[PDB]
């Protein structure tokens, strides 16, 4: 009968009961755990059956108790860690955890030996200190997060307290070497080469370890139980490997394994990320819960048998220097600290200070003190006072960080914030105040008690001198609608108005990278280095977000395009048989390094059938290091030059993937930044015309957000003529993954329109989950496609061989180098120009300013239209195009006459293209995306007006009617339309005129579709039995 | 329910009819502006926005 | 159903609340999603009042 | 009794081609793109290739 | 130093191979299971290491075997 | 534990009676707990297998 059930479930629940009665107390539930927890051990010191469970359990081995527990606490530790905020200030976190506890450490070590009456020796006093400095605040880094602003304080306090539990751990085993286990002696060589040993192939075995799981999380597809029992094994592995097998901290390990799956999470599918969030939590939780169950236990068992009233007073003069240490630690670090580009600030500083809370990780390295000091006093007195270290710190320094958070200032909620929350909870109100009145009349739910109804459906606001001033400014800022008096601008109140056009402008902004991140088109990184920005440029004085910020988000330079241009100067079944050999001669090295080893393993299996016979007589410098290899192998150090070199030329290759990957993951965030931010000033200048009043702010605001979209265009521009093949891999990854999250949305709302149950849904939904796992697991690098493979994926060309046949028999590749101008602006259209290579400058007075790249068509509604040119055309780099000619063009359009035709196909392209503006004018107000325009266009349909004898009757299937070239006359000829224009619902019919040089053209999209809840067909059974399928999906029969 | 071809009503007032008609008007603007007026009151707790405008100049 | 309403009353009037009161916060979870996806309210602030929905 | 049913398969494939079209939707709004245009599309149309499974 | 720690890690790999290599094989991981934990007896029974693993976790009392 | 230990009761049938009941009432869990739950078990009941099988074998 294992006592160990027992003690583990009443330590579950007695944490479930303590969590639960004191949610609104102050008073964490640990210290309460460790009350729980003393009068368990004095009933178990009075009766004997509580005893007998408390002594199996609670008396346990050190090492058994860090090998189950520690693990846990630090992988939970370093994967609840955001690694991205954690690594862009990680040179704070490394300075002041490191050189902190190292010098808390011997501050703490110092004052034990001065002040304490036992007479400890150093090593013992920096076990102490070791196990003093170890500071694990959660509730502060809680209390950080939810409370508004100082986001960065709640990331540095949370790294440093890991890094800090990291190396106090290393600290404690190399002292608890130095007093209790060995007391050995050794050189100075050996030590340099243990501390070697410990503080660096720590976190290169973590890196190992990391790098095989990540290895082996991306290769699993559709079982989640898989995947989460390779991450606790993982972790166990590498502690239990790294600590026992070897000498490696694995504390450190299993910080950097932590880190490195952190920052991997993609490679995990999104609901075992969830689950293995909340798992690791419940996991640390039990720890934790079982760690101060277990030191309440032991203390009022064996630790308080010595505690004597000058120990008591030591504890409260050693947790008032503990506090003090680390305050003038903070401080003597804050000029470095500060000289990095987040520095602390006093209230930082302060609340670095006070949230130095101690816990599960410093009771545990007490407790293996009292277990391995046995029936000496030196443990009682190390549990005693780390025990009322951590009880002193959770009290008084939980319920004073919330009170002091209060004064200081940075609990406070700001003004954009309250007003967001406020305009929630109004559109929740008056949502329910609707439901309601619906609910009221409804034939079944009348006689309801409304009371209770109104009583328990109430969301109230969670957020309810200088405050009120600054907002009477603001009020005074902005008269507008709610004063409806006229006036004139003075220079005071221009600057008012800009500068609150400002405000607006940057809101939207962030409102716009949230949209897109919600609609699954930003990434998570990309989304919080924007907002950052945005909120960084509304703190200046009359700054936007500007672009010379933005261009460290894809900014390559650095090792690794000069890394990637080294290797491909060094590289540029046979092969792999010779790899197969130098692997499978990779052991006997091992082994030389009995027969005389079997005749030395039959003289390497004949120098390996002398050099597989010298490469096949080399195949009948790198063939020059082989003939090398082999002339030595004629003449053990041969064949470790051998294996070694064969192990070069191969794993060169391997290198260079490792670099593509890491500048396509760089690149990635690069692009994602600069498309956000284009589709942001594109969302916003929609939206600017209802903000913006004055039209001299109009004016500046939309100067300079073209001035930011263009410079963004041409940077990223640039940076694909930079590396062309990764930046084919991440656009084609960007399109993989809008088709795959448009397909998702297509089987959700095939889900919520009942057309599909649940589990055919689920199916569906598990094979769009596959590939995009499958996508993340991409190659980096595309091979960029020749002209040939760009002209077959023209959008209007592409459909159809026989006209890719006849428009490749009559292209003309055409090369331009820099600064040459390919049309001019007001010469005749004489053809098309696809862009194959680099970018272009299509500088035109519409002043319309424009950079195109590669698949970009210039000309097509001038070889419609048979109009002079809008824009000229000026090179930025080496551009080639395909010049399709206007002769080859009219003759392909009089050839091709089919039901898609080459007309069809050419005014659809164009028409979409002049018809998204138009709709994204007139319903940005109702929040849609530009994407969701450009989809909602794509199902539209140009009209044979020539076929209904050019007039055009308006019924209720149609949705919007854009009018794309021509003119146009309206209902009882009221009036004349002759522009690109959306017809309005007032237009009830259109009579087109025919004339010459118009032939006008519309463009129509009809109200969604009737999902039919038919759905008739027929199938036919083919040949094997096996391939049977429904052919007429007709949903419109008899 | 009057389609999209009808695009004025006409309704003639007489005795006994009083005619009445029910319009929905296209959502709402969801405005990303969202000005407003907060006013502290007593002991610096209660400060509260009152004036949700999300109109102004 | 209505004769079904007569034989227990209190029992009725409790089972209309419990769906008058889940049909008003399952639309208010809309309404906060609504928001989440038109970026007025951001993820921290929507997972607030989706707690409250939650809780209620 | 492992045989699928014919309105199950009746409304898988009707759901496929609903996928289908979408994604060739989604395929003629990428490819007039002005950052997506140069995308190897080949690859593009194999990964989304939504098969049924019921044949 | 606890053992049980390498063998429950060391089942827990063996049954992620496991699972991700039959896939496709309508045979069950549970008997390649049983496969490799034979595999691993005999290698214990060779050599005294893996005696000592799983010596001390696999000969379990039957009363925490069940309780488990 | 209780069950089989302290009282002589056939625990396998209180564990049972106790999975059925908390299946019953799931609707007094939290959903995303009820998530949670599913695929916790279903890894403890995972590991289980594979322990025992290993160590059959």
């Given at each position: 009968a294992?006592k160990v059930i027992?003690?583990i479930?009443?330590?579950?629940?007695?944490?479930?009961?303590?969590?639960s009665l004191?949610?609104?107390?102050?008073?964490?539930?640990?210290?309460?755990?460790?009350i729980?927890?003393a009068?368990?051990?004095?009933?178990?010191?009075?009766?004997?059956?509580?005893?007998?469970?408390?002594?199996?359990?609670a008396h346990?081995?050190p090492?058994?108790?860090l090998?189950?527990?520690?693990?846990?606490?630090?992988?939970?530790?370093?994967f609840?860690?955001?690694?991205?905020t954690?690594?862009?200030?990680?040179?704070?976190?490394?300075?002041?955890?490191?050189?902190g506890?190292?010098?808390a450490s011997?501050?703490?070590?110092?004052?034990?030996m001065?002040l304490?009456?036992?007479?400890?020796?150093?090593?013992?006093?920096?076990?102490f200190?070791?196990i003093?400095?170890?500071?694990?605040?959660?509730?502060?880094?809680?209390?950080?997060?939810?409370?508004?602003?100082?986001?960065?304080?709640?990331t540095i306090?949370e790294?440093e307290?890991?890094?800090?539990?990291?190396?106090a751990?290393?600290?404690?085993?190399?002292?608890?070497?130095?007093?209790?286990?060995?007391?050995?002696?050794?050189?100075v060589?050996?030590?340099?080469l243990?501390?070697?040993?410990?503080?660096?192939?720590?976190?290169?075995?973590?890196?190992?370890?990391?790098k095989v799981?990540?290895?082996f999380?991306?290769?699993?597809?559709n079982?989640?139980?898989?995947?989460?029992?390779?991450?606790?094994?993982?972790?166990?592995l590498?502690?239990?490997i790294?600590?026992?097998?070897?000498?490696?901290?694995?504390?450190?390990?299993?910080?950097?394994?932590?880190?490195?799956?952190?920052?991997?999470?993609?490679?995990?599918?999104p609901?075992?990320e969830?689950?293995?969030?909340?798992?690791?939590e419940?996991?640390?939780?039990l720890?934790?819960?079982?760690?101060?169950?277990?030191?309440?236990?032991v203390?009022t068992?064996?630790?308080?048998?010595?505690?004597?009233?000058?120990?008591?007073?030591?504890?409260?003069?050693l947790?008032?220097?503990?506090?003090?240490?680390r305050?003038?630690?903070?401080?003597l670090?804050?000029?470095?600290?500060?000289?990095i580009?987040?520095?602390?600030?006093?209230?930082?500083a302060?609340?670095?200070?006070?949230?130095?809370?101690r816990?599960?990780?410093?009771?545990?390295?007490?407790?293996?003190?009292?277990?391995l000091?046995?029936?000496?006093?030196?443990?009682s007195?190390?549990l005693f006072h780390?025990?009322?270290?951590?009880?002193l710190?959770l009290?008084?320094?939980?319920?004073?960080?919330?009170t002091?958070?209060?004064?200081?200032?940075?609990?406070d909620?700001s003004i954009?914030?309250?007003?967001?929350?406020?305009?929630?909870?109004?559109?929740?109100?008056?949502?329910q105040?609707?439901?309601?009145n619906?609910?009221?009349?409804?034939r079944?739910?009348?006689d309801?008690?409304?009371d209770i109804?109104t009583?328990?459906?109430?969301?109230?606001?969670?957020?309810?001198?200088?405050?009120?001033?600054?907002?009477?400014?603001?009020?005074?800022?902005?008269?507008?609608c709610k004063?409806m008096v006229?006036?004139?601008?003075?220079?005071?109140e221009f600057?008012?108005m800009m500068?609150?056009a400002?405000?607006?402008?940057?809101?939207?902004?962030?409102?716009?990278?949230?949209k897109?991140?919600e609609?699954?088109?930003?990434a998570?990184?990309?989304?919080?280095?924007?907002?950052?920005?945005?909120?960084?440029?509304?703190d200046?004085?009359?700054q936007?977000?500007?672009v010379?910020?933005?261009k460290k988000?894809?900014?390559?330079?650095?090792?690794?395009?000069?890394?990637?241009?080294?290797?491909?100067?060094?590289?540029?079944?046979?092969?792999?048989?010779?790899?197969?050999?130098?692997?499978?001669?990779?052991?006997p090295i091992?082994?030389?390094?009995?027969?005389?080893?079997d005749?030395?393993?039959?003289?390497?299996y004949?120098?390996?059938?002398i050099y597989?016979?010298?490469?096949?007589v080399?195949i009948?410098?790198?063939?020059?290091?082989?003939a090398?290899?082999?002339?030595?192998?004629?003449?053990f150090?041969?064949?470790?030059?051998?294996?070694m070199l064969?192990?070069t030329?191969?794993?060169?290759?391997?290198?260079?993937?490792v670099?593509?990957?890491?500048?396509?993951?760089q690149?990635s965030?690069?692009?994602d930044?600069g498309?956000?931010?284009?589709?942001?000033?594109?969302?916003?200048?929609?939206?600017?015309?209802?903000?913006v009043d004055?039209?001299?702010?109009?004016?500046?605001?939309?100067?300079?957000?073209?001035?930011?979209r263009?410079?963004?265009?041409?940077?990223?521009?640039?940076?694909?003529?930079?590396h062309?093949?990764?930046?084919?891999?991440?656009?084609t990854?960007?399109?993989?993954?809008?088709?795959?999250?448009?397909?998702?949305?297509?089987?959700?709302?095939?889900?919520?329109a009942?057309?599909?149950?649940?589990?055919?849904?689920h199916k569906?939904?598990?094979t769009?989950e596959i590939?995009?796992?499958?996508?993340?697991?991409?190659?980096?690098?595309?091979p960029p496609?020749?002209?040939?493979?760009?002209?077959?994926?023209?959008?209007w060309?592409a459909?159809?061989?026989?006209l890719?046949?006849?428009?490749?028999?009559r292209?003309?590749?055409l090369?331009?180098?820099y600064?040459?101008?390919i049309?001019?602006?007001?010469?005749?259209?004489?053809?098309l120009?696809?862009?194959?290579?680099?970018?272009?400058?299509?500088y035109?007075k519409?002043?319309?300013?424009?950079?195109?790249?590669?698949?970009?068509?210039?000309?097509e509604m001038?070889?419609?239209?048979?109009?002079?040119?809008?824009?000229?055309?000026?090179?930025?780099t080496?551009?080639?195009?395909?010049?399709?000619?206007?002769?080859?063009?009219?003759?392909?359009?009089?050839?091709?006459?089919?039901?898609?035709?080459?007309?069809?196909?050419?005014?659809?392209?164009?028409a979409?293209r002049?018809?998204?503006p138009?709709i994204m004018?007139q319903?940005?107000?109702?929040?849609?995306t530009?994407?969701?325009?450009?989809?909602?266009?794509?199902?539209?349909?140009?009209?044979?007006?020539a076929e209904?004898?050019?007039?055009?009757?308006?019924?209720?299937?149609?949705?919007?009617?854009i009018?794309?070239?021509?003119?146009?006359?309206?209902?009882?000829?009221?009036?004349?339309?002759?522009?690109?224009?959306?017809?309005?619902?007032?237009v009830?019919?259109?009579?087109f005129q025919?004339?010459?040089?118009?032939?006008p053209?519309?463009f129509?999209v009809?109200n969604?579709?009737?999902?039919?809840?038919?759905?008739?067909g027929?199938?036919?059974?083919?040949?094997?039995?096996?391939l049977?399928s429904?052919?007429?999906?007709?949903?419109?029969m008899?």
């Amino acid at each position: 009968a294992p006592k160990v059930i027992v003690f583990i479930s009443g330590s579950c629940l007695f944490g479930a009961i303590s969590r639960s009665l004191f949610k609104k107390l102050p008073i964490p539930y640990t210290v309460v755990l460790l009350i729980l927890g003393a009068i368990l051990g004095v009933v178990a010191s009075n009766v004997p059956l509580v005893e007998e469970h408390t002594r199996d359990v609670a008396h346990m081995d050190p090492h058994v108790l860090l090998q189950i527990f520690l693990p846990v606490l630090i992988f939970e530790s370093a994967f609840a860690m955001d690694v991205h905020t954690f690594m862009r200030s990680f040179s704070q976190v490394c300075i002041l955890a490191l050189f902190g506890l190292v010098v808390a450490s011997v501050l703490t070590a110092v004052l034990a030996m001065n002040l304490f009456n036992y007479n400890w020796n150093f090593s013992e006093a920096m076990m102490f200190g070791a196990i003093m400095s170890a500071t694990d605040p959660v509730a502060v880094v809680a209390l950080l997060k939810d409370l508004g602003a100082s986001k960065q304080l709640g990331t540095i306090i949370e790294g440093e307290s890991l890094l800090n539990d990291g190396c106090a751990i290393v600290i404690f085993n190399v002292f608890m070497k130095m007093v209790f286990f060995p007391q050995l002696t050794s050189t100075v060589g050996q030590n340099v080469l243990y501390f070697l040993q410990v503080a660096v192939a720590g976190p290169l075995w973590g890196y190992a370890v990391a790098k095989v799981t990540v290895f082996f999380l991306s290769h699993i597809f559709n079982d989640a139980l898989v995947e989460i029992t390779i991450t606790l094994a993982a972790t166990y592995l590498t502690y239990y490997i790294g600590d026992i097998w070897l000498e490696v901290s694995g504390v450190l390990a299993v910080v950097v394994l932590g880190l490195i799956v952190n920052a991997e999470k993609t490679s995990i599918s999104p609901e075992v990320e969830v689950f293995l969030h909340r798992f690791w939590e419940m996991l640390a939780y039990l720890a934790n819960t079982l760690i101060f169950m277990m030191v309440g236990v032991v203390v009022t068992q064996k630790a308080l048998v010595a505690v004597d009233k000058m120990d008591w007073f030591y504890l409260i003069i050693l947790y008032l220097a503990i506090t003090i240490i680390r305050g003038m630690v903070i401080s003597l670090f804050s000029p470095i600290l500060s000289r990095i580009g987040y520095g602390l600030t006093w209230r930082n500083a302060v609340i670095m200070t006070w949230g130095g809370l101690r816990g599960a990780v410093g009771l545990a390295l007490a407790l293996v003190v009292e277990n391995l000091a046995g029936n000496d006093v030196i443990g009682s007195k190390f549990l005693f006072h780390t025990a009322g270290i951590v009880v002193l710190t959770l009290v008084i320094n939980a319920t004073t960080i919330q009170t002091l958070l209060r004064i200081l200032g940075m609990s406070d909620i700001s003004i954009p914030k309250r007003l967001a929350m406020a305009g929630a909870v109004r559109r929740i109100h008056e949502g329910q105040n609707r439901t309601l009145n619906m609910l009221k009349s409804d034939r079944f739910l009348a006689d309801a008690d409304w009371d209770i109804a109104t009583a328990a459906c109430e969301i109230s606001d969670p957020y309810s001198p200088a405050d009120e001033l600054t907002l009477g400014e603001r009020k005074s800022v902005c008269p507008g609608c709610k004063a409806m008096v006229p006036n004139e601008p003075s220079p005071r109140e221009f600057a008012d108005m800009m500068e609150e056009a400002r405000l607006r402008m940057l809101k939207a902004e962030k409102i716009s990278y949230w949209k897109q991140f919600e609609h699954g088109m930003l990434a998570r990184e990309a989304l919080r280095l924007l907002v950052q920005h945005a909120e960084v440029a509304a703190d200046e004085k009359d700054q936007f977000i500007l672009v010379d910020d933005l261009k460290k988000s894809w900014q390559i330079k650095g090792i690794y395009p000069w890394l990637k241009r080294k290797l491909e100067d060094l590289i540029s079944a046979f092969e792999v048989t010779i790899n197969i050999a130098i692997v499978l001669n990779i052991v006997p090295i091992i082994m030389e390094f009995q027969k005389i080893e079997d005749a030395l393993r039959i003289s390497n299996y004949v120098f390996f059938v002398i050099y597989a016979i010298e490469a096949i007589v080399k195949i009948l410098h790198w063939n020059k290091f082989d003939a090398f290899i082999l002339v030595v192998a004629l003449v053990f150090r041969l064949l470790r030059g051998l294996r070694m070199l064969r192990l070069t030329k191969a794993l060169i290759p391997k290198l260079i993937l490792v670099v593509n990957g890491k500048i396509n993951n760089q690149l990635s965030l690069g692009y994602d930044v600069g498309k956000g931010y284009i589709i942001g000033e594109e969302e916003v200048g929609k939206i600017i015309d209802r903000m913006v009043d004055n039209k001299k702010i109009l004016r500046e605001l939309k100067h300079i957000s073209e001035t930011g979209r263009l410079q963004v265009v041409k940077e990223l521009g640039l940076l694909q003529r930079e590396h062309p093949g990764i930046a084919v891999s991440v656009k084609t990854r960007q399109a993989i993954r809008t088709i795959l999250n448009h397909s998702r949305e297509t089987i959700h709302e095939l889900q919520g329109a009942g057309l599909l149950d649940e589990m055919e849904a689920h199916k569906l939904e598990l094979t769009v989950e596959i590939k995009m796992k499958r996508l993340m697991n991409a190659p980096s690098s595309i091979p960029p496609p020749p002209p040939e493979n760009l002209l077959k994926n023209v959008s209007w060309l592409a459909g159809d061989m026989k006209l890719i046949d006849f428009i490749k028999a009559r292209a003309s590749l055409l090369h331009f180098d820099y600064g040459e101008v390919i049309v001019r602006e007001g010469d005749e259209s004489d053809g098309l120009f696809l862009i194959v290579s680099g970018l272009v400058k299509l500088y035109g007075k519409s002043v319309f300013e424009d950079y195109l790249t590669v698949g970009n068509v210039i000309g097509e509604m001038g070889v419609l239209t048979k109009k002079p040119r809008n824009a000229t055309v000026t090179c930025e780099t080496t551009v080639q195009v395909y010049f399709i000619t206007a002769e080859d063009m009219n003759i392909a359009i009089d050839t091709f006459t089919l039901y898609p035709s080459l007309e069809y196909r050419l005014w659809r392209v164009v028409a979409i293209r002049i018809a998204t503006p138009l709709i994204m004018e007139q319903m940005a107000f109702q929040g849609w995306t530009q994407e969701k325009v450009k989809l909602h266009l794509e199902r539209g349909y140009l009209v044979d007006l020539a076929e209904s004898h050019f007039q055009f009757n308006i019924d209720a299937t149609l949705e919007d009617v854009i009018l794309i070239n021509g003119t146009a006359y309206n209902a009882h000829t009221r009036e004349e339309i002759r522009s690109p224009c959306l017809i309005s619902r007032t237009v009830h019919k259109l009579t087109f005129q025919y004339t010459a040089t118009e032939e006008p053209r519309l463009f129509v999209v009809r109200n969604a579709e009737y999902n039919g809840p038919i759905l008739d067909g027929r199938l036919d059974v083919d040949s094997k039995r096996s391939l049977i399928s429904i052919t007429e999906i007709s949903s419109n029969m008899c």
